[PDB]
Every structure is written in C-alpha cells, then in structure tokens.
Amino acid sequence: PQFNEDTLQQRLQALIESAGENWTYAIFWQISHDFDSSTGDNTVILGWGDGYYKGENTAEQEHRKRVIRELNSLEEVTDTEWFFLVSMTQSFVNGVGLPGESFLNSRVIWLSGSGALTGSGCERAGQGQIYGLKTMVCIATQNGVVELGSSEVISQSSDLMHKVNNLFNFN
C-alpha cells in the first residue's frame, strides 16, 4: 500500500482489464514543477506519466499512417488511438483544464455523455468528444491524476472507484 513508478504500467493495465465496463484507455498525469523566476512561484504542472490503451478521410489516414511509421522509425489509425497518441504531449497547469481542476481541489470529475463533455468548459473534454469519446473521468491521486475515457456512456460505479482506490496512492 505505497506504490512506486515501477508498477504504474501494471496498475493502469489492471484498472481497465479488470473493469466491468468498456473503458477505452487509462492515463496517469504525473506532477512536475515549473519555477517562475519572474514571481518566484513553484507551480505544479501535470504532464504525461504513463498510459494504457485498450481500444475496441484519405488525407487524414495517410497523415496518421505517416506519423505512426515515422514514430516506429525512431493499418488504419482510429480516432481513439490518435487521441491517445496526441495526449502524450499535453500538459496542464494546476487548477486549469480537466486534469488541473481535478488536482487543485483533489476532485473526482466524472463527465458522462457528449453534452457533459462539450458543456464542461475544458478543452481536453472537447477534444475527446471530437474523437468519439462519450465519457471522460479525472480522479486526483497523491502523485497526480488518473484519467479514464470511453466511447460509451458510463455511469460512476462503486466497483470502478473501488479498483481506482486499490491501484493508486491517496492522502
């Protein structure tokens, strides 16, 4: 009952392989810091920690296929796969956006349905909805924020929250 980075990938896999509902992916946003010389403040910034993707036009597909094999270097690429990939380079200032609001106030933010996403005022929820997601969840942990996404509409179950609680650190 005090997890470290070394089991993070296993814990993300456990969360959605064992979950009773059809979750598409899980992401862990890790806390980092950005000291601001101009004001002397040490602001929390959330960035990519790890992730686990489960899953289910011509120019776009070719653009996506070209980025994938270019990454492979150093057949279809689906909307949710792309969203997952694109997520890797996002970051969030504490209190800002879906992961940031979750962390700042130590919140569970559960957005179920297309309208909950588009009405959230969070650009990441808007983006997820564009890529076909209908449920997005952020849950604040001791070391960051766990995010879940699904192309299905999923209500908050105590079973899932029980799994989250058994797989991450809480203050």
């Binding site: 990938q9 890790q30 980092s32 960035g47 990519w48 920690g49 790890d50 992730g51 993707y53 994938i68 990454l71 492979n72 796969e81 997952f84 990939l85 890797m88 380079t89 970051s91």
Partner: peptide, 19 residues
C-alpha cells in the same frame, strides 16, 4: 522526466499495436 516517460509509453503502444 516526461520525455522518456513519453518514449517508454510510446514504445509499448507501438509494440502492442503490431498485434
């Protein structure tokens, strides 16, 4: 660090996709 965290995750995702 985030960039190697990215690389590690990217590696796994690409590897798991080939399946």
């Amino acid at each position: 660090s985030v960039p190697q965290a990215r690389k590690a995750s990217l590696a796994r995702f690409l590897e798991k996709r080939k399946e």
